[PDB]
Protein backbone atom coordinates (compact mmCIF):
# COMPACT_ATOMS: atom_id res chain seq x y z
CA UNK A 1 0.00 0.00 0.00
CA UNK A 2 1.19 3.50 -0.96
CA UNK A 3 1.86 5.99 1.91
CA UNK A 4 -1.37 7.35 3.39
CA UNK A 5 -2.64 9.36 6.34
CA UNK A 6 -5.97 8.00 7.63
CA UNK A 7 -6.57 6.45 4.19
CA UNK A 8 -5.92 9.67 2.23
CA UNK A 9 -3.40 8.99 -0.56
CA UNK A 10 -3.80 11.99 -2.90
CA UNK A 11 -2.24 15.19 -1.52
CA UNK A 12 -5.60 16.95 -2.06
CA UNK A 13 -7.29 14.68 0.49
CA UNK A 14 -4.34 14.89 2.92
CA UNK A 15 -4.59 18.70 2.83
CA UNK A 16 -8.34 18.63 3.62
CA UNK A 17 -7.74 16.04 6.36
CA UNK A 18 -4.92 18.01 8.02
CA UNK A 19 -6.83 21.29 7.65
CA UNK A 20 -9.74 19.75 9.57
CA UNK A 21 -7.47 18.27 12.25
CA UNK A 22 -5.60 21.46 13.12
CA UNK A 23 -8.58 23.86 12.97
CA UNK A 24 -11.19 21.60 14.63
CA UNK A 25 -9.12 20.00 17.42
CA UNK A 26 -7.89 22.35 20.17
CA UNK A 27 -5.61 19.84 21.91
CA UNK A 28 -4.15 17.13 19.61
CA UNK A 29 -3.75 13.52 20.75
CA UNK A 30 -0.29 11.91 20.88
CA UNK A 31 -1.41 9.02 18.64
CA UNK A 32 -2.49 11.48 15.95
CA UNK A 33 0.90 13.21 16.16
CA UNK A 34 2.66 9.84 15.80
CA UNK A 35 0.53 8.79 12.81
CA UNK A 36 1.61 12.03 11.12
CA UNK A 37 5.27 11.24 11.89
CA UNK A 38 4.75 7.65 10.68
CA UNK A 39 3.22 9.00 7.47
CA UNK A 40 6.11 11.42 6.84
CA UNK A 41 8.58 8.59 7.53
CA UNK A 42 6.77 6.44 4.95
CA UNK A 43 7.06 9.16 2.31
CA UNK A 44 10.84 9.11 2.83
CA UNK A 45 11.00 5.31 2.75
CA UNK A 46 8.95 5.19 -0.46
CA UNK A 47 11.19 7.90 -1.90
CA UNK A 48 8.61 10.67 -2.29
CA UNK A 49 10.45 13.71 -0.91
CA UNK A 50 8.31 16.04 -3.05
CA UNK A 51 5.12 15.14 -1.16
CA UNK A 52 6.97 15.17 2.17
CA UNK A 53 8.00 18.76 1.55
CA UNK A 54 4.46 19.65 0.47
CA UNK A 55 3.10 18.07 3.67
CA UNK A 56 5.68 19.70 5.98
CA UNK A 57 5.17 23.11 4.32
CA UNK A 58 1.36 22.88 4.68
CA UNK A 59 1.45 21.85 8.34
CA UNK A 60 3.91 24.66 9.07
CA UNK A 61 1.55 27.29 7.63
CA UNK A 62 -1.49 26.07 9.59
CA UNK A 63 0.20 25.18 12.88
CA UNK A 64 2.01 28.55 13.05
CA UNK A 65 -1.08 30.60 12.17
CA UNK A 66 -2.79 28.80 15.04
CA UNK A 67 -3.04 31.01 18.15
CA UNK A 68 -3.12 27.69 20.04
CA UNK A 69 0.38 27.48 21.55
CA UNK A 70 0.33 23.68 21.38
CA UNK A 71 0.31 23.59 17.56
CA UNK A 72 3.44 25.71 17.32
CA UNK A 73 5.22 23.10 19.44
CA UNK A 74 3.51 20.21 17.65
CA UNK A 75 5.03 21.25 14.31
CA UNK A 76 8.49 21.51 15.90
CA UNK A 77 8.09 18.01 17.32
CA UNK A 78 6.95 16.59 13.98
CA UNK A 79 9.78 18.29 12.06
CA UNK A 80 12.45 17.20 14.59
CA UNK A 81 11.43 13.57 14.02
CA UNK A 82 11.38 13.92 10.24
CA UNK A 83 14.85 15.50 10.34
CA UNK A 84 16.20 12.51 12.28
CA UNK A 85 14.94 10.12 9.57
CA UNK A 86 16.39 12.33 6.81
CA UNK A 87 19.69 12.60 8.69
CA UNK A 88 20.02 8.81 8.72
CA UNK A 89 18.61 8.16 5.24
CA UNK A 90 20.36 10.98 3.35
CA UNK A 91 22.87 12.51 5.77
CA UNK A 92 21.16 15.87 5.39
CA UNK A 93 18.16 17.71 6.78
CA UNK A 94 15.21 19.24 4.90
CA UNK A 95 15.54 22.91 3.95
CA UNK A 96 12.64 24.69 5.64
CA UNK A 97 12.09 28.46 5.41
Amino acid sequence: AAPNLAGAVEFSDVKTLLKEWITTISDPMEEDILQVVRYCTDLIEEKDLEKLDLVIKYMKRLMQQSVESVWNMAFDFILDNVQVVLQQTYGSTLKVT
Side-chain angles (χ1 to χ4, degrees):
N4 70 99
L5 183 64
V9 181
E10 284 287 14
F11 180 67
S12 306
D13 300 305
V14 176
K15 263 187 73 192
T16 308
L17 198 83
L18 284 164
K19 192 178 189 282
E20 196 181 347
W21 179 44
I22 300 152
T23 56
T24 290
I25 266 73
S26 188
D27 186 14
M29 298 294 187
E30 237 283 307
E31 253 293 301
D32 291 324
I33 296 291
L34 264 41
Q35 280 190 42
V36 168
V37 174
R38 186 180 171 186
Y39 170 66
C40 287
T41 299
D42 291 351
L43 294 170
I44 300 160
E45 285 173 13
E46 301 307 310
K47 307 184 188 306
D48 191 352
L49 294 173
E50 186 190 353
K51 205 188 280 174
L52 168 69
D53 201 41
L54 289 168
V55 166
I56 294 294
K57 269 210 252 281
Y58 188 69
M59 296 195 292
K60 187 182 174 206
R61 210 217 299 177
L62 291 187
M63 295 184 188
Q64 292 181 355
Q65 271 163 12
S66 201
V67 72
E68 288 162 26
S69 307
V70 67
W71 285 116
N72 314 341
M73 286 301 302
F75 176 74
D76 285 353
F77 182 83
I78 295 157
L79 187 52
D80 291 339
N81 282 280
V82 169
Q83 295 293 34
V84 163
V85 180
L86 291 165
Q87 187 75 44
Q88 48 199 353
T89 310
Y90 292 99
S92 62
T93 51
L94 181 73
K95 169 94 163 282
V96 164
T97 36

